[PDB]
Amino acid sequence: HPFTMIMDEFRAYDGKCVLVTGGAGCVGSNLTGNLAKAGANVIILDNLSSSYEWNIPEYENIEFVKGDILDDEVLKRVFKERPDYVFHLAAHFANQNSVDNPEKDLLVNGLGILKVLEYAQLVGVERFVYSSSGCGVYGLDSKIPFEEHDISISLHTPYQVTKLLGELYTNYFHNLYEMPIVNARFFNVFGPGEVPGKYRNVIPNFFYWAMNQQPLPITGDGSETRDWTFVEDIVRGLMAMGVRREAIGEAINLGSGTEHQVIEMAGIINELTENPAGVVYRPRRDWDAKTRLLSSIDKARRLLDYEPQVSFREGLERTHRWFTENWELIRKSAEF
């Protein structure tokens, strides 16, 4: 097998204490499962504001703490366990939600990461890994494909603003207090573990609508593109970031390095679900000025030996399977 660094680099988590904020969500549920498999003791802190307790994997060594990253009482409760690793995935999500609710977005994404960083400073951590966003740091003035040095300060939603703000604070803690941080810049993550809903991503919403035989609403002309990254590839990146010394202090894109049109994505989902309803065209969402996103993943290749293992098609099949296996829980949980 070629998977020597994926397997034995990660055994480094065995017996370690890992706090995952936002651990009941899409990336979090996948990450926490893999950490538990690697023998970590995992603490999830999540307020379930955009996630469901049933999504958390069932492992003896995962402890679920329902609470808010803005609440200093619960923060002391988890940080007195002295986590060796913090993966900070909790966030007010995402673009539209943030335009509607900019102050709550700042409190959760700004004051929330600041508090979590402050407690991490008090106890000391081997690593603090933050889920930043490609959309959040690359602007219309950034060249495609996006390289990590080529960030923008001219953004289109409060979510984008506060994703960058997170990097501003992790870099600050690194610079002044020598905290070993890593800034992961995710690109349109998808896969098992994202329940559909009003403020959620297009792929799970399209699966939900397609499986109710509804037409898929395309917000644009369909030629808009995204770099969609399968969640298990994201997780492999994150786990590498926790242990590689060369990741310390760095910002690193986690993407597929390929782009697909919205119309293709919709076609694949309709094909897999045997949806006869096709698509309908709607106007672009007003804040959606960045209609092409494509990452450069060469830095991740260099520092992490990161390489996506799952094709777009394979990813969508795995997503479909999760939908069919959990359809009743999803039906009940989805809030539009």
Ligand X SMILES: NC(=O)c1ccc[n+]([C@@H]2O[C@H](COP(=O)([O-])OP(=O)(O)OC[C@H]3O[C@@H](n4cnc5c(N)ncnc54)[C@H](O)[C@@H]3O)[C@@H](O)[C@H]2O)c1
Ligand Y SMILES: O=c1ccn([C@@H]2O[C@H](COP(=O)(O)OP(=O)(O)O)[C@@H](O)[C@H]2O)c(=O)[nH]1
**Which residues are known catalytic residues?**
159
User: Min. distance of Cβ 8 from ligand X in angstroms?
Assistant: 27
- Report residue 78 as tokens: 């988890």
- Can you tell me the distance from the alpha carbon of 130 to that of 85, in angstroms, rounded to the nearest whole number? 11
Query: At closest approach, how far in Å is the CB of 317 from ligand X?
Result: 19
Pairing of strands 189-190, 260-261: unpaired
Residue 93 is a binding residue for ligand X (CB under 6 A)? yes
With vertex at residue 320, the alpha carbon angle to CA 314 and CA 324, rounded to the nearest 5 degrees, is 145
- Environment class of 164 (CB within 10 Å of its CB; exposed 0-12, middle 13-18, buried 19+): buried
Q: Site mask, ligand Y, residues 209-248, x = CB under 6 A?
A: --------xxxx---x-x----------------------
Tell me how far apart the terminal alpha carbons of the chain are, to the nearest angstrom. Answer: 44
- Partners of 65 in the beta sheet? 45
Among 87, 128, 130, 169, binds a copy of itself (CB under 8 A): 169
Q: Position 5: which residue type?
A: M
99 binds a copy of itself (CB under 8 A): yes
CB of 54 to a copy of itself, least distance (A): 34
Residue 186 dihedral angles phi and psi, to the nearest 5°: -75, 145
Q: Does 22 bind ligand X (CB under 6 A)?
A: yes
Q: Is 135 in the site for ligand Y (CB under 6 A)?
A: yes
Which among ligand X, a copy of itself, ligand Y, none contacts residue 157 (Cβ within 5 to 8 A by kind)?
a copy of itself
* The one segment of 67-75, 174-182, 302-310, 321-329 that binds ligand X by CB under 6 A: 67-75
133 binds, among ligand Y, a copy of itself, ligand X, none (CB under 5 to 8 A by kind): ligand X
**Interaction of residue 74 with a copy of itself, rule CB under 8 A:** no
User: CA-to-CA distance for 78 and 256, rounded, in angstroms?
Assistant: 34
Other Cβ atoms closer than 10 A to 84: 20
- 42 assigned ligand-binding residue: no
Place of tokens 């990660």: 10
- How far apart are the C-alpha atoms of 51 and 66, rounded to whole Å? 11
46 annotated to bind ligand: yes
Please name the residue that has the structure tokens 């919403």: 205
Residue among 39 and 102 whose Cβ is closer to a copy of itself: 102
Contact between 225 and 260 (Cβ < 8 Å):
yes
What is the rounded CA–CA span in Å between residue 91 and residue 112?
A: 8
Binding residue for a copy of itself, selected from 75, 116, 161, 202, defined by CB under 8 A: 161
| 219 binding a copy of itself? (CB under 8 A) | no
Nearest CA among 134, 160, 128, 130 for reference residue 147: 134
Residue 204 makes contact with ligand X by CB under 6 A: no
Q: Least separation, in Å, of the C-beta of 15 and ligand X? A: 26
The residue whose Cβ lies closest to ligand Y is: 202
Query: Does residue 115 touch a copy of itself according to CB under 8 A?
Result: yes
* Rounded Cα gap, residues 171 and 249, in angstroms: 7
Binding residue (CB under 6 A) for ligand Y from 201, 275, 295, 296: 201
In the chain, % helix, strand, coil (3-state, to 5) comes to 45, 15, 40
Q: Which residues bind a copy of itself (CB under 8 A)?
A: 99, 102-103, 106-107, 110-111, 114-115, 118, 137, 151, 153-158, 160-161, 164-165, 167-169, 171-172, 175-176, 251, 286-287, 289
Binding-site residues for UDP: 95, 188, 202, 217, 219, 226, 285, 288
Q: Which residues bind ligand Y (CB under 6 A)?
A: 94-95, 135, 188, 201-202, 205, 217-220, 224, 226, 262, 288
